[PDB]
Design a protein around this ligand. Sequence first.
Ligand SMILES: *[C@@H]1O[C@H](CO)[C@@H](O)[C@H](O)[C@H]1NC(C)=O
Lengths: 49, 49
Amino acid sequence: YVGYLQPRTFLLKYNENGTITDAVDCALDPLSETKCTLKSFTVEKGIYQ
Amino acid sequence: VVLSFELLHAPATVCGPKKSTNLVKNKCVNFNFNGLTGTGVLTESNKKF
Ligand SMILES: *[C@@H]1O[C@H](CO)[C@@H](O)[C@H](O)[C@H]1NC(C)=O
């Protein structure tokens, strides 16, 4: 498999071990943009600019 | 001769002459770890690098 890298901004989650467990790609979809804005992988109910 | 000093977050490995001093614990002692300078107490760290 071959893929190509692009300049993007990511939100990476480091656990207590120190390993990157999860990641969010901000520009993928509006939910990911909301997550990157709020700096949390869980977004509560509401409207977010 | 133009000596360009490119510095960034990496092992420098270009460290002009300086001696080493025995490590101390549980005492506020100035530290210079491979160019990272500061003050504080040094303790054995349980985190897994
Ligand atoms: C993460 O740290 C915990 C602490 O006890 C340990 O049990 C666990 O094995 C560690 N995870 C890995 C992948 O080593």
